[PDB]
């Protein structure tokens, strides 16, 4: 009986300077020192954000809280900035296999538009920039790799000669 | 510390994937040392650990085509599974759980995307010579450099805003 890790919601998108709080719920019961959260931004791995509940890793800004116990844990952001726009995975480290949650995207509402981008200050708009790149460089990479797919029957028919 | 992951980004299917993390800041003598994938829609599947003496556990869900293997001496462990079909096609990670945060996760390679590829052409290719299947090789160069300018230039205006909004 494995223990699944339901994140509600899914997505979500939100301004920043707002507050929000997304949750997980676990099957069955887990002790608070055991459920955790990672935040994953494209392009690179997961990172370990919050352990057992309620401590920050290091790095991670204060903004970040968590809280929680029994089947029921959340992670809150205080006033959210353009960087924490990420996917957010809880997981329990109790029982095997250690199952995680199956995220929270949490995208930047209305971030693509002149009209509210102009109101960011000059160091939020350049870090956002940039943040862009890993996102495109792992889309040409997926069809990179897609095309090595292609590539492959035609290298196995040219040598079956 | 950091983990290192190598090994090949394809795989045709019912055949082996094995991938090698090259720990190098602990050594795998110590703690414990897993194996994680990540499945494209964002699930991620613990495939198993290899302890700090050589037990391992592996995920029921696997079956037993997964083995987990390590060299002492090159303070390296392996990943291996067996007969893979296309349900395997995921990022698969190596990571070190740590004891002092009650195992969470505090250390993760770079992953490596794994793909695994059907290649059932065998009907179609065969009425093909040599040569036409050389032509369709390169046939898919300038297919690809499309896809990838599209790409490029669907960032071109998703980040003009910004510019733009920085010059004011
Ligand atoms: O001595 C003790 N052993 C434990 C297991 C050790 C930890 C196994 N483990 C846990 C979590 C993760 C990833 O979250 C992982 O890769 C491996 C026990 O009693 O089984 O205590």
């Known amino acids: 009986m494995d223990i699944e890790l339901t994140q509600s919601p899914a997505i979500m998108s939100a301004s920043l300077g707002e507050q929000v709080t997304m949750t997980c719920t676990a099957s069955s019961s887990v002790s608070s020192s055991y459920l955790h959260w990672y935040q994953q931004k494209p392009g690179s791995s997961p990172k370990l954000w919050i352990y057992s509940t309620s401590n920050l890793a290091s790095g991670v800004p204060a903004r970040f809280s968590s809280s929680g116990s029994g089947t029921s844990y959340s992670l809150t952001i205080s006033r959210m900035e353009a960087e924490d726009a990420a996917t957010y995975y809880c997981?329990?480290?109790?029982?095997?296999?250690?199952?995680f949650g199956g995220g929270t995207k949490l995208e930047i509402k209305r971030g693509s538009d002149y009209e509210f981008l102009k109101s960011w200050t000059v160091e939020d708009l350049q870090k956002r920039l940039l943040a862009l790149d890993p996102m495109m460089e792992q889309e040409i990479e997926e069809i990179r790799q897609k095309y090595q797919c292609k590539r492959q029957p035609i290298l196995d028919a040219i040598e079956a000669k | 510390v950091k983990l290192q992951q190598s090994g090949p980004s394809l795989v045709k299917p019912s055949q082996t994937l094995s991938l090698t993390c090259s720990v190098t800041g602990d050594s795998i003598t110590s703690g414990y040392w897993n194996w994680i994938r990540k499945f494209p829609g964002n699930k991620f599947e613990y495939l198993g650990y290899i302890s700090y003496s050589g037990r391992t556990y592996y995920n029921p869900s696997l079956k037993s085509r997964i083995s987990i293997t390590r060299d002492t001496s090159k303070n390296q462990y392996y990943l291996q599974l067996n007969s893979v079909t296309t349900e395997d096609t995921a990022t698969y990670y190596c990571?070190?759980?740590?004891?002092?945060?009650?195992?969470?996760?505090?250390?993760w390679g770079q992953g490596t995307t794994v793909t695994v590829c059907s290649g059932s052409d065998y009907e179609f290719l065969k009425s093909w010579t040599v040569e036409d299947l050389q032509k369709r090789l390169l046939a898919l160069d300038p297919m690809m450099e499309q896809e990838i300018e599209e790409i490029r230039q669907k960032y071109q205006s998703k980040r003009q805003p910004i510019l733009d909004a920085i010059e004011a």
């Open positions: 990571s070190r759980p740590y004891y002092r945060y009650d195992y969470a996760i505090d250390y």
């Open positions: 997981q329990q480290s109790w029982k095997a296999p250690y199952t």
